[PDB]
Amino acid sequence: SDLEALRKKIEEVGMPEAVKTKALKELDRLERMQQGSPEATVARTYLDWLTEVPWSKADPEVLDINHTRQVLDEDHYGLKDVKERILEYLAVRQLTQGLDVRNKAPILVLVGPPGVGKTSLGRSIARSMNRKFHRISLGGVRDEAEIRGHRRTYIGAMPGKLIHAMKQVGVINPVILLDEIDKMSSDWRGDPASAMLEVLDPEQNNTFTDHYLDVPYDLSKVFFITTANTLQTIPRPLLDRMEVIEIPGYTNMEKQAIARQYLWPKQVRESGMEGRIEVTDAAILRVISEYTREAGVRGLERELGKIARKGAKFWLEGAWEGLRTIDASDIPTYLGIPRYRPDKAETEPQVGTAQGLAWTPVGGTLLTIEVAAVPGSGKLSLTGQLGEVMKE
Amino acid sequence: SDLEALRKKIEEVGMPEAVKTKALKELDRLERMQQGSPEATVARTYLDWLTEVPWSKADPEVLDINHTRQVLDEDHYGLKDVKERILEYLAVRQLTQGLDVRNKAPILVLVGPPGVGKTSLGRSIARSMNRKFHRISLGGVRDEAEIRGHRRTYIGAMPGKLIHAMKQVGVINPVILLDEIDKMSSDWRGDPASAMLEVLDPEQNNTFTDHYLDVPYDLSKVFFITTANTLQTIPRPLLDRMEVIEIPGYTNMEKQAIARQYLWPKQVRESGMEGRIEVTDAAILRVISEYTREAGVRGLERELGKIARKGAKFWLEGAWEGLRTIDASDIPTYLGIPRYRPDKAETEPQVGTAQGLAWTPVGGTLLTIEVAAVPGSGKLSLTGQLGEVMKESAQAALTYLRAHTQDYGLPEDFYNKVDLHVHVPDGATPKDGPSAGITMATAIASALSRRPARMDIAMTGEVSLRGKVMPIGGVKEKLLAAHQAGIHKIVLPKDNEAQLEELPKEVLEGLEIKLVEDVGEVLEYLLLPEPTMPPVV
Amino acid sequence: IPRPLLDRMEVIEIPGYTNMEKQAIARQYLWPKQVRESGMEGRIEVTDAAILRVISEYTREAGVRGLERELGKIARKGAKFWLEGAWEGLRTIDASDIPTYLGIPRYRPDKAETEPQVGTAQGLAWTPVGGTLLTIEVAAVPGSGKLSLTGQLGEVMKESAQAALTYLRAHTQDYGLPEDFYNKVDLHVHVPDGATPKDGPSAGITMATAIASALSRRPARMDIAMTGEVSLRGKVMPIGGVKEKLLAAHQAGIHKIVLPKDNEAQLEELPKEVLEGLEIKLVEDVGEVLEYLLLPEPTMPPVV
Ligand SMILES: *[B]([O])([O])[C]([C]C1=[C][C]=[C][C]=[C]1)[N]C(=O)[C]([C]C1=[C][C]=[C][C]=[C]1)[N]C(=O)C1=[C]N=[C][C]=N1
Ligand SMILES: *[B]([O])([O])[C]([C]C1=[C][C]=[C][C]=[C]1)[N]C(=O)[C]([C]C1=[C][C]=[C][C]=[C]1)[N]C(=O)C1=[C]N=[C][C]=N1
Ligand SMILES: Nc1ncnc2c1ncn2[C@@H]1O[C@H](COP(=O)(O)OP(=O)(O)OP(O)(O)=S)[C@@H](O)[C@H]1O
Ligand SMILES: Nc1ncnc2c1ncn2[C@@H]1O[C@H](COP(=O)(O)OP(=O)(O)OP(O)(O)=S)[C@@H](O)[C@H]1O
């Protein structure tokens, strides 16, 4: 009595026409082969993964950009360029009704130094665009199975993660996130970074064929977001499928705002104090200058954590009247000795030494190139752990 | 009862003789096994797999080609050679009755940098001649549960993907698109890379022996097309079976025209727009020249997209009326900041330099080679991240000049009293190849001799130690890069005069190509007659 | 193959075909199959040279498949022309016709130069696909005795180079060499092309011929092609791969080969038809090579 009840489950879901028969012909193949005999499982579970995976259900998307704008502006500061590539996307589809509403979702890749908030976009963009969301942990995957599970004839027979994802979310168009897309390998023990070439291919996405199922699934309408700290290690084909979006890294003036707006209160609101302690804008720079080198702010908040936590001890031993504004002359008492000196700038004309600029993902850095000429033969030495190209 | 239909179904399709008796045998083995069992299913489905696969059921061969051509053109600009490969195929079909079909007939493999249209061709070539198409994604597949399907007795079972394609397709002559065949992974465990060896083999594939359909199948008259953006990773045997076909990327003229016809209108309709905005042709050359550093279009379309997205984001913030055109002036407003440089040909005759043409898959680059001669002791220092091959070529041309010092007006004993330095800007990007020979041979001459070298003329060619000018490779992408810069004089080795017929006839009119067979002609053609600077003294 | 499977067998290698075979294996086997299959019932005919070009020019593999495909392209384009134009009988495709059908060349041939030049010799070298033809050029310019070896030479050949140079440094007067070049002339040896890496000591005497010609300023004949290994005393040593080498020379038009004495054996496996076209000299001491190669009066003035 279950199969016919399962038939109605099949009779309504989706569905692609020929796949329906390609599915019904298996249910009929399960008319016989009595429940019992082991292959019945392989057929049954197949029909489960076949029917549970969503066909023809797209979550009604939001359409007011001004609404979504301030839903983005409430969680992440700056990143104007990223927010537009979303706003532009809505303004495009909003302009489309009746015909060609959900054609494709642009596969973005977000590249930037580790310390900025990239993996926090997908967690936020979802609520913004009001779509389902399920990140895929692709940091270190080294087996061409998590993309396409092993064939249903094997003993495990579980589809790839990219279908699990489609199952967890209920809709056909979720904002699937891929974490650190460049940590995949191309060596022995598979090379999943090559399997992706079938996934992210836009004009050929809608015919994705996992190995567990044998039916072409559709991923034309799915918002693939991609993060990668660098992009000199992405296979050249992949990088020509995605869309590069430069997550720059934050300057002090922008770093300042983030602490002031988001980072500082987020800690306080999670450290008991409802405002009984406060830091001063002028003191913020000290934590930024004398205690943080990394680009971004992951390495900035955990100094506020000390500031917040040390507030507890000083409060838990004994409270005070209202707030106690921490100022610039106070941080060394909380964060201890400054662990990153500010690089001064030399101020008189010197001999054989000139000012040089050098930049890293960490940010800008001053460099004083030093030369000294001594009487001797015709030799040139290049010390200072110089790379090869600079010597040239 | 119900089996009898299936029994009647066997005689209907196909069939080869031996399998027929083989089939009826197992049917007459099935028909006497009782209605469902651990043995019925593992045998019944075999027959329901023998019947569904197509036997000797095919599609016609369209003698009409003017149609088959007039459908290919509406899908892909350029690609003239691949299109011709299909025409000649149909032309053979028209000229043949009562003989083999695919006995050594094109099992194509397309090669070319990513971004060009290869995986977007199978569906086209199928629509060209009405053959039911199917894709087989193979990038990363590293097992044998594929093409050589599992044996029919394991708890589960399924034939190989290939046999599974013939089931999914309806006929015996489909167009299978073995996508990304150059990602075959030989991570120990039976890389199929060995499995295909039987399939692609143009003479033995008519007896492809699966493990589910253990009966021999003939994939002879299938039409394989496998895309692959390299060849080093393909095993040496398997590559042989295929017929390599290169796709050399696109020029600037193609990338321009291909945008006006296919790319841009494709992006308008998807962007909600219909003709509320339209770009100007020259303002696409600006997008190709400055915002695109790749052969192909899978990157270009992502620029026209952002033009369209930005072309609609405005329509909501404020509407307008009539086609809002876009020119070069307006380009940076929509896309962004110039992300690349249109390297300009620089004209005044300089001393100790020389134009140089370098080749790269993405296209040609216009290099300038700078050489300094200063008082010293002959130490020859080569910087600019030169590769090992080029360094050796540089020493060649120099060792040539030290042998003919009197001819080109060089210092008699410069070898002993002049520190010589060669620089190839820029410094970051590594360089290699020996085609830079006659470039340096000029510059080094124009350095030691103070006769400045013209830079209207851009030269290229491998130089031997005797003074012969060897031939080089990739002359088209160089001259294309040349004309785009704005140079109309080229110095070239005789043995490359053959490869001129790939340049567009348009550009060939505005090129004063010179064919030289020895470096002596070049140094007379390049160096200005009378010196202008004092020597090293 | 696992050693249990390997040893319990009779390995019978298959070498890979020679061009002399291909000009025959095509006409007899591949071409007729490829014209029937093409549907062209005999409206087309290929000739020796027309095949000969396709053998060397448009093919760089020891294997008929490569050759076979091209005939498919000659067959197809031999049919696509038919629908656009008929003819009375059949059009015998000749050598000069191939580029019209099979397009622009891919691997140009290697002509055998012809006036004797200064410091030059046509060395032979073989690679699995087949023997090639490598010239060797050397430069003598007043300097500090520097030896510069370029052309992506392998470490073996560079050592063999010094060997020949050491030999001449011993027996200066015997040949026309400047007495004190070793510390006044900088010899440079270049073996084009610059891209293709080169290895192996079998080109011993050819560098000895080239280098000696340079210092002596005497021109060296190029109609002769030589090969072999050279020792310090000058004992020319035997070298393998003769069938692939001499066969490469014959096609290039060379008709005078110089071969080590010990390699008198490998002559037996060459096709007896090609031997009579070759004048093979057997040499044992490099002195017998320099004499046979060099002209007895230089043309370029000395280096000093
Ligand atoms: B030549 O061998 O065809 C040429 C060498 C060259 C030319 C001009 C300036 C420097 C070197 N080779 C190339 O074009 C190489 C690429 C190459 C190398 C070996 C074989 C084939 C092709 N070009 C470069 O090195 C290069 C560097 N940076 C940008 C673009 N090209
Ligand atoms: B010799 O060792 O038989 C000869 C060396 C040689 C000398 C001069 C020019 C080319 C080659 N060997 C070859 O021809 C080698 C193969 C070899 C190398 C080392 C030891 C034994 C055999 N082949 C090449 O170097 C070659 C072949 N084809 C093109 C380019 N190089
Ligand atoms: N503009 C911003 N304003 C405020 N907080 C921000 C901003 N950008 C990022 N963040 C914070 O950054 C954190 C998220 O950083 P992550 O995305 O986890 O680091 P990530 O570098 O993107 O991921 P990696 O590279 O794998 S460590 C959150 O605490 C965010 O609040
Ligand atoms: N005339 C054309 N030539 C090439 N590409 C075209 C043309 N017209 C449209 N395109 C599009 O350009 C893209 C070509 O890239 P594809 O062939 O699909 O990918 P690919 O060439 O296989 O590269 P890889 O190897 O898969 S990374 C597709 O999006 C096509 O729709």
Side-chain angles (χ1 to χ4, degrees), chain B residues 216-288:
Chain B
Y217 214 99
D218 69 311
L219 318 178
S220 157
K221 43 195 69 176
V222 78
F223 185 68
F224 285 141
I225 294 180
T226 82
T227 73
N229 58 332
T230 173
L231 292 171
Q232 274 83 239
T233 178
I234 298 179
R236 297 295 93 186
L238 198 151
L239 158 72
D240 177 54
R241 318 224 140 72
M242 321 194 359
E243 164 178 344
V244 68
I245 294 202
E246 293 196 5
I247 305 296
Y250 293 136
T251 71
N252 263 12
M253 330 184 72
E254 278 161 353
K255 275 156 92 167
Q256 209 278 344
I258 198 187
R260 172 57 45 185
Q261 304 183 356
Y262 292 79
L263 288 164
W264 172 256
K266 170 62 171 290
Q267 279 293 146
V268 168
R269 290 166 297 141
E270 287 205 356
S271 45
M273 295 322 199
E274 63 90 31
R276 302 202 257 258
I277 186 178
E278 267 292 340
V279 293
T280 58
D281 315 277
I284 297 187
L285 262 161
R286 185 160 156 81
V287 177
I288 298 178

Side-chain angles (χ1 to χ4, degrees), chain A residues 84 151 153 188 190 198 214 392, chain B residues 137 145 156 164 187 313 384-385:
Chain A
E84 299 316 305
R151 180 184 308 285
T153 181
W188 57 293
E198 178 190 25
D214 70 326
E392 305 213 346
Chain B
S137 45
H164 201 298
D187 289 345
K313 170 70 162 308
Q385 273 283 69

Side-chain angles (χ1 to χ4, degrees), chain B residues 397-418:
Chain B
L398 163 69
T399 319
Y400 166 81
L401 300 179
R402 315 173 35 183
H404 301 94
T405 181
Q406 186 152 308
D407 286 321
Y408 320 124
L410 269 64
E412 197 66 24
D413 67 323
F414 76 88
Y415 81 90
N416 188 33
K417 295 184 180 298
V418 162

Side-chain angles (χ1 to χ4, degrees), chain A residues 109-290:
Chain A
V109 65
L110 318 170
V111 54
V116 72
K118 293 170 296 197
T119 43
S120 174
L121 264 294
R123 181 54 65 182
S124 88
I125 293 195
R127 299 169 300 104
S128 316
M129 299 173 71
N130 186 251
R131 300 165 163 241
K132 307 301 173 48
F133 168 90
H134 163 221
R135 114 174 193 103
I136 275 165
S137 315
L138 292 172
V141 63
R142 303 229 195 285
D143 38 353
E144 197 268 329
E146 312 207 340
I147 287 77
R148 299 172 284 205
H150 300 284
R151 180 184 308 285
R152 82 187 194 192
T153 181
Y154 290 111
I155 59 189
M158 52 193 303
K161 293 178 74 68
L162 194 40
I163 301 310
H164 274 172
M166 270 304 181
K167 174 59 217 73
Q168 312 298 117
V169 306
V171 311
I172 194 181
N173 46 3
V175 299
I176 293 191
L177 186 46
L178 309 184
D179 181 65
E180 63 185 342
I181 204 30
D182 65 3
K183 301 314 177 36
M184 295 158 189
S185 163
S186 294
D187 73 316
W188 57 293
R189 189 65 173 171
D191 44 11
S194 82
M196 283 318 182
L197 298 185
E198 178 190 25
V199 169
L200 309 164
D201 196 355
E203 307 294 324
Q204 298 276 12
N205 192 7
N206 51 21
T207 322
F208 182 78
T209 43
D210 72 282
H211 295 292
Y212 177 84
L213 301 99
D214 70 326
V215 286
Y217 202 60
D218 182 6
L219 310 185
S220 274
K221 46 186 72 65
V222 57
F223 200 100
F224 268 90
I225 299 182
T226 320
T227 64
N229 289 337
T230 185
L231 79 168
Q232 298 283 168
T233 173
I234 298 179
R236 292 296 98 190
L238 265 178
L239 186 65
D240 272 320
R241 302 214 206 284
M242 296 164 280
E243 154 62 19
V244 196
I245 292 299
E246 294 284 346
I247 301 282
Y250 298 127
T251 182
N252 303 149
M253 280 294 295
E254 280 192 353
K255 276 158 86 72
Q256 198 158 322
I258 8 60
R260 164 51 62 103
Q261 289 278 14
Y262 299 87
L263 285 148
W264 170 236
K266 181 72 76 72
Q267 286 298 111
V268 188
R269 291 176 293 238
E270 294 214 32
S271 189
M273 321 305 206
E274 204 59 25
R276 312 176 318 214
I277 191 179
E278 169 61 285
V279 299
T280 54
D281 51 357
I284 299 180
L285 300 187
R286 284 211 52 178
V287 172
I288 298 179
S289 295
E290 307 192 337

Side-chain angles (χ1 to χ4, degrees), chain A residues 203 241, chain B residues 76-77 114-120 180 250 258 297-298:
Chain A
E203 307 294 324
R241 302 214 206 284
Chain B
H76 296 88
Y77 183 85
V116 71
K118 312 175 305 311
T119 51
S120 163
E180 285 267 328
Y250 293 136
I258 198 187
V297 293
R298 204 142 62 248

